[PDB]
Amino acid sequence: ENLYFQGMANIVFIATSLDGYIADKRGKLDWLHSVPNPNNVDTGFVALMERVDGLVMGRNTLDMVLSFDCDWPYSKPVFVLSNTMTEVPQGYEDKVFLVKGKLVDIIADLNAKGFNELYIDGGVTIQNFLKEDLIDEMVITRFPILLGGGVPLFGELESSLSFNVIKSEVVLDSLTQTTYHRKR
Amino acid sequence: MANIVFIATSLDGYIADKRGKLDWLHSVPNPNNVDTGFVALMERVDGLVMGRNTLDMVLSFDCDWPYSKPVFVLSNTMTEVPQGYEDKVFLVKGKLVDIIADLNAKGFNELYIDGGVTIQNFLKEDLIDEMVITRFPILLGGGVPLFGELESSLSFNVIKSEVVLDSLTQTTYHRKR
């Protein structure tokens, strides 16, 4: 019963195109540079990372973040959902931790260990959370570009899921950033 | 001279739900019947361009014709207009660039483009100048999408964004020329 009100939250924080893609058809994020940010203005990430206890991420996102030329961007543990992945690559054993099983169980287990506020990342992972109605908050930064193909943020659902608008503002002059909480 | 989209969408980008229905549009209360741009839009535009799907949806509401301006239905199959709508609805056939050229020449210069399939076809030829999207806070998880495929991306500028009726966001995008 009501883990959110008891202080446990699953939080989405993601950039999408106008048409709902989180990567283009080549798996790239170059379109994120379609809007200038010369002065390196922060639009929520430092504060998200300070708030969350860890991340739950899919293998597709992990594989795109892991690289030879990579500066690991996360200050909190990344829990990676793979039925497929048996071991964490060299250099990332204190950064990335494997979790397996039913989402509800995985979440119960992390929460019991004190990882109560989780940053849920990755399209398949987010979609899977939403299929069990496990997302409490989403902050979506929408870019004024139609990509016309790519990796979708959202998928299919058994029934519609309603949210409240907590806040919406224009950031960096040409982005909208809207904060949704799931309706109780 | 402008081709303008003015449409409501779910958070996940649908313009009708998985059953073809629009109930989710009455999920945000509007007891005072506030205008969220439609009246000012109809005043501005010279006409509408829509397709068979939107025509049929409007006719399905069993209400008074809502449009003060002529409605052009873009269709390469329809040859006759629904009975009673001969003074209201006109068919246009052929290449889009030609259709727009012919309408503009007749003084139909500001056009409200409606319909998923029609908007998509304008987008595939980069013929959309402005879009006002009113986004509802609901994941439908299925339905009729607003957007489809493009060969290549299209960039816009955010002219304005605001919360309307407390729970909706309404953003005005102009095509980056």
- Does B158 contact A175 at a Cβ distance shorter than 8 Å? yes
- Does A176 contact B167 at a Cβ distance shorter than 8 Å? no
What backbone torsions phi and psi does residue A136 show, to the nearest 5 degrees? -95, -35
Q: Any bridge partners for residue A9, and if so which?
A: A117
Distance from CA of A17 to the nearest CA of B (A): 10
Q: At what angle do helices B52-60 and B116-124 cross, to 10 degrees?
A: 160
- Does B141 contact A164 at a Cβ distance shorter than 8 Å? no
What backbone torsions phi and psi does residue A59 show, to the nearest 5 degrees? -70, -30
Of how many residues is chain B composed? 177
Q: How far is A157 from B34, CA to CA, in rounded Å?
A: 31
Residue reference for tokens 């990755």: A122
- Does A162 contact B138 at a Cβ distance shorter than 8 Å? yes
Spatial CB neighbours of A160, under 8 Å, sequence gap ≥ 6: B10, B17, B24, B138, B139, B140, B141
Q: DSSP characters for chain B?
A: -EEEEEEEE-TTSEEE-TTS--GGGGSS--TT---SSHHHHHHH-SEEEE-HHHHHHHHHT-S----SS-EEEE-SS--SPPTT-TTTEEEE-S-HHHHHHHHHHTT--EEEE-SHHHHHHHHHTT---EEEEEE-SEE-SSSEES----SS-EEEEEEEEEEETTTEEEEEEEE--
Q: Which long-range contacts (CB under 8 A, 24 or more apart) does A24-27 make?
A: A24/A147, A24/A149, A24/A150, A24/A151, A24/B153, A25/A147, A25/A148, A25/A149, A25/A150, A27/A64, A27/A151
Q: Which value in Å is the resolution of this experimental model?
A: 2.1
Residue B72 contacts residue B48 (beta carbons within 8 Å): yes
Experimental technique behind these coordinates = X-ray
Q: Which long-range contacts (CB under 8 A, 24 or more apart) does B127-130 make?
A: B127/B3, B127/B96, B127/B97, B127/B100, B128/B3, B128/B4, B128/B5, B128/B154, B128/B175, B129/B2, B129/B3, B129/B4, B129/B174, B129/B175, B130/B2, B130/B3, B130/B4, B130/B5, B130/B172, B130/B173, B130/B174, B130/B175
- CB contacts, 8 Å: A148 with chain B: 147-154
How would you label B32-58 residue by residue, b for 16+ Cβ within 10 Å and e otherwise?
eeeebeeeebeeebebbbbbebbbebb
Chain B segment 2-61 residues within 8 A of A by beta carbon are 10-13, 17, 24, 27
CA angle (B132 as vertex; B127, B138 as ends), nearest 5: 120
Per the structure block, which two tokens stand in for A125?
């992972």
What backbone torsions phi and psi does residue B131 show, to the nearest 5 degrees? -135, 130
Of how many residues is chain A composed? 184
**SS3 of A24, please?**
coil
Per the structure block, which two tokens stand in for B174?
């102009």
| The residue type at B78 | M
Chain A segment 147-176 residues within 8 A of B by beta carbon are 147-149, 153-165, 168-170, 173-176
Residue B85 contacts residue B67 (beta carbons within 8 Å): no
Q: Out of 1.10.3720.10, 3.40.430.10, 3.40.50.300, 3.40.718.10, which CATH number does the structure's domain B2-175 have?
A: 3.40.430.10
Fold observed for domain A9-182: Dihydrofolate Reductase, subunit A (3.40.430)
Residue B20 contacts residue B144 (beta carbons within 8 Å): yes
Report how far apart, in Å, the C-alpha atoms of A46 and of each of A31, A52, A70, B64 are. 22, 10, 19, 53
- CB contacts, 8 Å: A18 with chain B: 133, 147, 156, 173
Residue A163 contacts residue B11 (beta carbons within 8 Å): yes
Spatial CB neighbours of A80, under 8 Å, sequence gap ≥ 6: A56, A57, A58, A59, A62, A88, A96, A97, A98, A99
Q: How far is CA A32 from the centre of its chain?
A: 16
- Does B166 contact A165 at a Cβ distance shorter than 8 Å? yes
Spatial CB neighbours of B137, under 8 Å, sequence gap ≥ 6: A162, A163, A164, A165, A180, B11, B167, B168
- Does B140 contact A163 at a Cβ distance shorter than 8 Å? no
Residue reference for tokens 């030879």: A68
CA dihedral B127, B129, B135, B141 (to 10 degrees): 20
Nearest to B156 among A144, A157, A170 (CB): A144
Q: How far is A109 from B84, CA to CA, in rounded Å?
A: 65
Q: What SS3 string covers A135-183?
A: CCEEEEEEECEECCCCEECCCCCCCCEEEEEEEEEEECCCEEEEEEEEC
